[PDB]
Amino acid sequence: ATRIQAVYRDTGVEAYRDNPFIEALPPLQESVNSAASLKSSLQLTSSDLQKSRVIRAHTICRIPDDYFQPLGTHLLLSERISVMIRGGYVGRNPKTGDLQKHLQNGYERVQTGELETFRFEEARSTAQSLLLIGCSGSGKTTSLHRILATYPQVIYHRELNVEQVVYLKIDCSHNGSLKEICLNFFRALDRALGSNYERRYGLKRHGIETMLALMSQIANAHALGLLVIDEIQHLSRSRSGGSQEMLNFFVTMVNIIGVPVMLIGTPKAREIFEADLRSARRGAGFGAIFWDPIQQTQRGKPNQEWIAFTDNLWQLQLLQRKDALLSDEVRDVWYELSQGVMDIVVKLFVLAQLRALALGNERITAGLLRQVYQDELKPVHPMLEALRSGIPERIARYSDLVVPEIDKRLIQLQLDIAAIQEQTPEEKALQELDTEDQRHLYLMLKEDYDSSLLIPTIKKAFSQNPTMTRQKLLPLVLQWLME
Amino acid sequence: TRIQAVYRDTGVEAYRDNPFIEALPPLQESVNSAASLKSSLQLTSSDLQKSRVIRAHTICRIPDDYFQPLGTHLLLSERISVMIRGGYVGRNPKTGDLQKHLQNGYERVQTGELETFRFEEARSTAQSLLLIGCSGSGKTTSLHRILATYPQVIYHRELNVEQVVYLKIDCSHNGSLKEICLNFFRALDRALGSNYERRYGLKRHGIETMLALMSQIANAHALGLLVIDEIQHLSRSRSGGSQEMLNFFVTMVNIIGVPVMLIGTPKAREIFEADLRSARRGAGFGAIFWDPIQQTQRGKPNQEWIAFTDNLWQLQLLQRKDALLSDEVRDVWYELSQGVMDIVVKLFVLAQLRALALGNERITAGLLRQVYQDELKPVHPMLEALRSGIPERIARYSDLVVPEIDKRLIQLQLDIAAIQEQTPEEKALQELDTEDQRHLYLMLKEDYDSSLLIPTIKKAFSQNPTMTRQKLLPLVLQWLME
Amino acid sequence: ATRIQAVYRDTGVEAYRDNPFIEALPPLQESVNSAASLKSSLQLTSSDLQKSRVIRAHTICRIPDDYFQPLGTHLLLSERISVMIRGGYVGRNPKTGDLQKHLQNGYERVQTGELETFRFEEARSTAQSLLLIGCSGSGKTTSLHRILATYPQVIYHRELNVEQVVYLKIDCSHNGSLKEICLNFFRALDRALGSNYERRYGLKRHGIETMLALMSQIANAHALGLLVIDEIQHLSRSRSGGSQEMLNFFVTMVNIIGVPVMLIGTPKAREIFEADLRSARRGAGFGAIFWDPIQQTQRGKPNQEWIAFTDNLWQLQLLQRKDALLSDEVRDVWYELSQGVMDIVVKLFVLAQLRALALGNERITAGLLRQVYQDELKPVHPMLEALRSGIPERIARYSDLVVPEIDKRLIQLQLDIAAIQEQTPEEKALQELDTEDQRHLYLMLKEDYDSSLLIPTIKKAFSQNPTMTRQKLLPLVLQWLME
Amino acid sequence: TRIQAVYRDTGVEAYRDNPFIEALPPLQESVNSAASLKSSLQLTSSDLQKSRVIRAHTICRIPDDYFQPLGTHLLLSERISVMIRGGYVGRNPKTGDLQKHLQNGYERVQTGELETFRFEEARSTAQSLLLIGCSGSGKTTSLHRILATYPQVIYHRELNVEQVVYLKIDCSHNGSLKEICLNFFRALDRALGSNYERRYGLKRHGIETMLALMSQIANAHALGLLVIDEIQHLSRSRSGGSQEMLNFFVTMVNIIGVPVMLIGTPKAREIFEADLRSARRGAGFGAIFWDPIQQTQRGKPNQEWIAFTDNLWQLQLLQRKDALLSDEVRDVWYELSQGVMDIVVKLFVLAQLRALALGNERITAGLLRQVYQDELKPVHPMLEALRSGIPERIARYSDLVVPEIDKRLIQLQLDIAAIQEQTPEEKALQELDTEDQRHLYLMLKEDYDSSLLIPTIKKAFSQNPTMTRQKLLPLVLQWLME
Ligand SMILES: Nc1ncnc2c1ncn2[C@@H]1O[C@H](COP(=O)(O)OP(=O)(O)O)[C@@H](O)[C@H]1O
Ligand SMILES: Nc1ncnc2c1ncn2[C@@H]1O[C@H](COP(=O)(O)OP(=O)(O)O)[C@@H](O)[C@H]1O
Ligand SMILES: Nc1ncnc2c1ncn2[C@@H]1O[C@H](COP(=O)(O)OP(=O)(O)O)[C@@H](O)[C@H]1O
Ligand SMILES: Nc1ncnc2c1ncn2[C@@H]1O[C@H](COP(=O)(O)OP(=O)(O)O)[C@@H](O)[C@H]1O
Ligand SMILES: [Mg+2]
Ligand SMILES: [Mg+2]
Ligand SMILES: [Mg+2]
Ligand SMILES: [Mg+2]
Questions:
Q1: Residue nearest to atom 10 of ligand 2 (CA)
Q2: What kind and span of H or E run contains D372?
Q3: Hey, is the C-beta of B193 within 8 angstroms of any chain C C-beta?
Q4: I want to staple B3 with a disulfide (CB 3.0 to 4.6 A). Which of A94, B151, B330, B422 is the partner?
């Protein structure tokens, strides 16, 4: 409930002027670069690399939750959501009379008076329902959260008495029911504002059509902008009924409420929406946007998106014996291991580096990734192979597997790794030099020259000179390597 | 669309006192009938300087909001107005009480004073029309915009009837009569608020029962016009017989009045009208035939083509655009698109999108040829047939359409957003040809800002042809210091 | 649409203290005189007598609409409806919390603390749903139409953007249906509010439950005072469905909406609700105020109501040969002629003057009333004798009977009055005499003797002194006559 | 009425950790619970001057708001509380996972370590109470207020259950079993929001099937009590005979727990208890016999009657009233009403209304005798049997009820409303008695105002009696000009 006083900006577009619902929203000019400025990545330094192994493991355990790199389609989705929100208030101007009054006074103007022609049906071209479809585990939900967290949920109005709910979310659970969607809407609406609509209308006595009609009444009462329905895949097909009647329910849901609606679903939901999507008849709506995994070869050349993302992710590792450069084959092996799917790309790193922290040397190679895939990605094999196969039915039918119990596995492996006593060559050198952490400089020195000469000579140098500047150490240690 | 009715007089003799006709918009000449359909986009001058994604979206919005009234729409508008206003004469609701007049005439004819009388006359005002034209010539967006002037639902206070002016049905994908019959109900229950589909559209009823049952609903609401489009699909299917389906379309006369308009590709005409009793009912009010625009009328350039192309060209969104359209661009446009209406605009839209993608920011004939060779693969035989000039061969290739064209428009928008990503840092960050010094430059990034450090390693290999790397690591700092 | 800004009077009763909805209503301190001020009547003078017979016919035809004399039951109905209207807003207090918050707070206080006892009885609806059963032709509809129109319909508030609809009127028609009442409520709300609720809520697709569900929402949104369903007698039982399920439907209407509701009917409709009426159960409610015709006698003496109405109605006669005093024989006869039913008593007197203006002498006789009775009370012969019988079944069977189309018959009475040739001697006397305010003396003293000498004597005096007031004229015309 | 649940500890050991008991209002001692029930009208100090109708309405409202506790109510409250909070120990929803405990007990019994173990405990029968007393003694008004403290629908959020604490069933006049069975569903889906009647109470099932479905429905929701009122209509009606009437109430053991309560008139005892297996189920938790109060207790006056009458006496609303009650009026009440509590308040209300009607404006013995002899006729045999005291004679007439009392009250209200008022100018018309007076009045209105007109008319007759109207006029006008 981020209630703010309704401050009225001025919109350059003449169509959106004078509506208390549109000008209360954030301005368009400052939000142009906000979509591309939404990137968030962990700031790492050799200080964090210096810490103990268990602290490093804890730090690298939280990679898949605080990392985000925007892609090309991530801006198209933002633009579509913005135009969907700001194109759906032209009909609900509170100060000006409703649409029917406009139609009636226009029709009396054309009869006698002076008005040559009137266009009665004004097409709702700017705003339409969207039927987001993409393979499970591609990044649909998190991108939606980070796009939609920019708009404040509640903007209270004082001159009028209306509560403006800019957006809303509905989340379906496992094997849910049709009435459970309406109950989820009621619960989320009560959560957002503080109302008690469940007490008044949440009784199971009424039918589903009553829920729909009362939902329309509530959505007309409050200024409602967007209605997002999430994870259509989880709806059970047994107790629900026919796919035809589920499609009829969704079509009726789109029309009755009167505000734009956004649906998210698996490619198996395309089977449900086969009938309504084939038809090109106007008024059906349901424009489709296809999320796809990152492709490599476009115009015969490797893509820039994958290279940039791979470098930016590879910069986020904490290993003593890593390799700075990235080989073409090293990239390729886990490319065809992962097939480009977004969710398992970070999973492969967060499993492989963690496993290498206990298997031995702290380096990444093709064999390590192959072993990790073969011994820790057991369920997701057929979908990953079918994506290479390319048969649309094979891809569609065997999707929607989510390889559960990942975080528990990460914590169990973390505690297993923490249960250890074996030494490593470099920690006794760290404790040998000092606890003052001049190992920050030692790392810049040790990679090029043998430690058996540096450690005594840097100890003598630090005895005669209490602490050399980090810039000035390398020339003088060069002098001792030159003597 | 519940528009209340207010009456206005009409000068026509036969429509003097009729509560259905007088509630419609007044009669208009050809000055405005073929001029009110015009629409165009705004494109203020301040919209040229914006992000590339917004411009791509605005370009993609073009084909839905552009309509140029040609020299043919006036005839269609006049025919539609005449057919709508000429089917209400036989269904006058406000009738002077005929009981007393009929009885008085009855006594006068029984006593011998009056030798003749007209007691009652049935309805004889059912006429149809067919409209066929080549695919992509715009037979549907030239009908929605014409019929968007008349409001659908009119409610009268004096009586208790609702006037459904027009209703549009589309044929299914496989082709049979029963889905048309049930889709009439499925398209009727949406304009009003009702539940006709579940109450009447049951499986027990046969086809003849549905046809005899449509009349009661078509008389309860004063239906004016019923347009059936995409009649193409019913040429050959599991309909039970071509002659049986033709018998259906001719026994659709028993529906009360309601003049109907049929729309189909030129493949429908020869197969579908091959008998006198059905041919005379298809062209009951003239069969309007359409054709693509011709470049040369009689050796003189047509003003229609010039005006349409110039008005389309004045709707361009590029940073580097030439204001005037050179003759070669128009000539190449007509050579590629070949005249059909739908391919004239698709070439322009795709050319603009691919010019945005390539970064040329200019439209040229070579780019149009490239797009026509690239994306319009399935339609080529139809264009070559129109180039040939053989009427039968053109009739054979007359139902070719681009598949998943809306899908391709999205895939061209995705590439736009990727290339726009460009930041000031990688004027020095994005070059890997400097050296492999980036192995150690990672620590050098935090040491100082690379005001000259990136040029320092850049000047390192320029100054030094070859040197051992292990000596370069401190000597780069020597170059950094000096 | 009397959108007056709410002026908040103060009422000394503790229950109505500081309620924004209640205070906007008119005050009740001298409403007894206001309730007794409903009386309305035409103004008639002696001038209208000398007009032509068509003008008198129009004047007589104007009497039924603009005559109203309050009786005993009107005061009781006014006070009861005032109690129902004003007691209906103690629950929906806008400034403080609603009912559910009060019950929850009471439960939380009785749980622990020292609030020993809390009563959960709450309000049954908010006032009893009165059922005003009475015989047709008694005058219910006009009584409500006048005593319910002294309250402004809409009180448009200022700080709260809500409309305080104070009363409403549903009305069924011949051969109605169960869903027709639900549709008509929505349709009639538009005329009171000016909106288009029928477009969004009046779809025929909705079931009977959804109509009531939406009615609950809209009745809670707009502060509603009353809901007067009228003419249940017109409904047909078999067309709607099960007759015994109508009582279930009406109980569901009373329970869900929550605002006070008052039905109207005839003893034919009583058998629908008789199951709840016989039981003294609290919660069934449906208290009945029985409407009965005027009784002639009280304690072995004529009832004062009958004579009080009779004299007042008898003062409106403008007969030319009329005597000042009403004779006792006709007083005895028309009660048994009409059984005291309120509607037809006035109708007999209306038709008597029209019949006497054409049949001959201008007076009132028992035979004239008998002749009118056989003329224009043919459809109501069975019900009148059923009332005479006194058996409840005979009265119940013959209820709902009304005379059709009396107004059209009045027009043909007037047309027949228009076409006549011969004239009365008094018509000759008024025509030949200069009847410009000189007529009054002649009329007031015409019946003393023959007017043959009177016609020139008044002229002699008037020409003797043209300038006189009638006040001084009367002694002189009286003095010259006796000579 | 969906009150959310907040728990509280209970001192009783057996009600340890069971939400159903602990979600209810806490225990109170009898005197407090039997003293918190009293209520009375406001009786504002200065509301003794008003219109007659408003005061008449206030007096008519008296019977619905006057309640006064007595001795038996505390015992009734204790029994009701014990029944409601003693039938919930068998059903404790909060149970730990009993699979492991039961299987471990089975293992230790099987291996020979243990010797005995109680696996599953099943409930047996149910408690029941019957409350019988002569009609009009307050067996329903004293039950709609004792049960008012307990909330009806408690909602558990941690679980998903609704606790329907109490439910009131009333048999109809027919007395058939299926009416009771369907009325249970009516009351239950009136308490909650549901449609149980259509889902279960169809015509298809027989009596045994609904009787068995009541158990499932009363275990799905946690019932606490079930009171059946007016059982006297099941004595000898068309319910299949007294044998099946006994068998149905005996077979009502199969309903799970839910201690039932039976209320009836003293005649129902003989019909309802004639077999040993049914009487011990009727009086399973006592058998309290109500009886009207008496003036004396043991050679001395009873204080409860004194308190009841004295407290009732102040509540009257009259212009001039004797606040200090005279003992003669109390003796008159005990002579007429004889003790039954229904008649005591009705006599007072009717006497007050008739006192306002007559204008005597005082409550005295004569008015009480007149109203008792006029109105309360049918109740006479019961009172005359009460005077004698013979058990068979009093048992013969313990079912009589006065009808049409509400209609009589409404007609009395109309009578006192129709008093109206007489202005002095209007009264002047009534002053004129001879018909000639009124005739001369009617002729002589227009010229003269009535105030001066009536006196000179009256002296005209007081001076000269036998002299005619036309001869009267000159002398009247002679008086008038002067
Ligand atoms: N563009 C992205 N950049 C970085 N991480 C991403 C991106 N998209 C998805 N992820 C990662 O994928 C993980 C799971 O994605 P999720 O939203 O669950 O997809 P889905 O809902 O389809 O399973 C997230 O923890 C997130 O870190
Ligand atoms: N006069 C016109 N100007 C510009 N575009 C037009 C015109 N007429 C039709 N179109 C284009 O044609 C398309 C519609 O073609 P349509 O009528 O569906 O073909 P078909 O009748 O073969 O189905 C629209 O997208 C519209 O852009
Ligand atoms: N005080 C009165 N004076 C004259 N007419 C009355 C009076 N009260 C009622 N009426 C008559 O009652 C009639 C309307 O009541 P009625 O038709 O019985 O109601 P409903 O239509 O509900 O049966 C009117 O025609 C009116 O003449
Ligand atoms: N404690 C009481 N004090 C005063 N009046 C009472 C009391 N109990 C009952 N009454 C009166 O009894 C009437 C209801 O009687 P009821 O209980 O229905 O009789 P029964 O139990 O025979 O059906 C009420 O009008 C009420 O005034
Ligand atoms: Mg998801
Ligand atoms: Mg088409
Ligand atoms: Mg009526
Ligand atoms: Mg009782």
A1: B138
A2: helix D365-374
A3: yes
A4: B151
The Cα–Cα gap between D195 and D188 comes to: 9
Which chain A residue lies closest to B447 (C-alpha atoms)?
A471
Chain A closest-CA separation from residue C210 CA (Å): 5
Tell me how close the Cα of B149 comes to any Cα of chain A, in angstroms. Answer: 5
Task: Give the CA distances from residue D179 to residues A53, D169, D170, D175, in Å, rounded to whole numbers and listed in that order.
Answer: 79, 11, 10, 7
C-alpha closest to that of B36 among B83, B76, B74: B74
Write out the two tokens for D457.
Answer: 């008319």
C-alpha–C-alpha distance, residues C99 and C123, integer Å: 10
User: How many CA atoms, within 13 angstroms, populate the side-chain half-sphere of residue B410?
Assistant: 14
Tokens, residue A52: 């103990």
Residues of C in contact with D8 (CB under 8 A): 111-112
Resolution in A: 3.8
CA-wise closest residue to A462 among A454, A478, A50, A448: A454
3-class secondary-structure state, position D266: coil
- The continuous run of DSSP H or E covering B4 comes out as strand B2-4
Which residues 258-297 in chain C show a CB within 8 A of chain B?
A: none
Cβ atoms of B344 and B311 within 8 Å: the answer is no
Residues C143, C202 contacting (CB under 8 angstroms): no
Q: Which is nearest to C169 in space by CA: C210, C230, C114, C244? A: C230
Ligand 4 pocket member D136 (CB < 6 A): yes
E strand or H helix at B188: helix B177-191
**CB crowding C377-393: b at 16 or more within 10 Å, else e:** beebeebbebbeeeeee
Q: How remote is the CA of residue C138 from the centroid of ligand 7, in Å?
A: 9
Give the count of beta carbons closer than 10 Å to the beta carbon of residue B209: 13
| Contact status, residue A481 vs residue A449, Cβ threshold 8 Å | yes
Cα end-to-end distance, chain C, whole Å: 69
The C-alpha atoms of residue A79 and residue A150 are separated, in whole angstroms, by 13
Residue C211: which H helix or E strand, with range? helix C208-221
How big is chain C, counted in residues?
483
- The DSSP secondary structure of C438-466, one letter per residue, reads SHHHHHHTGGGS-STTHHHHHHHHHHH-S
Which positions ≥6 away from A391 have C-beta within 8 Å?
A: none
Q: Cα A226 from chain centroid?
A: 18
Q: Which residues of C touch D445 (CB under 8 A)?
A: none
Do D151 and D5 contact (CB within 8 A), yes or no? Answer: no
Q: Cα dihedral sign for C358, C360, C361, C366?
A: negative
Gyration radius of chain D's alpha carbons:
34
Measured from CB, residues less than 6 Å from any atom of ligand 1 are: A 64-65, 67-69, 71, 136-142, 342-343, 346
Chain position carrying tokens 């198996």: A268
C134 is in an annotated binding site: yes
Per-residue b or e along D376-389, where b marks 16 or more CB atoms closer than 10 Å to that residue's CB: beebeebbebbeee
Place of tokens 């059982």: D231
Contact between D66 and D40 under an 8 Å Cβ cutoff? The reply is yes
Find out whether A208 and A179 touch, Cβ atoms under 8 Å. Answer: yes
| Element holding C262 (H helix, E strand) | strand C261-265
Experimental method: cryo-EM
Q: How far apart are CA A247 and CA A285, in angstroms?
A: 13
Shortest-distance Cα residue to atom 8 of ligand 1: A139
- C301 touching B (Cβ < 8 Å): no
DSSP collapsed to 3 states, C150-200: CCCCEEECCCCCCEEECCCEEECCCCCCHHHHHHHHHHHHHHHHCCCHHHH
Q: Which two tokens stand for residue C84?
A: 């129902």
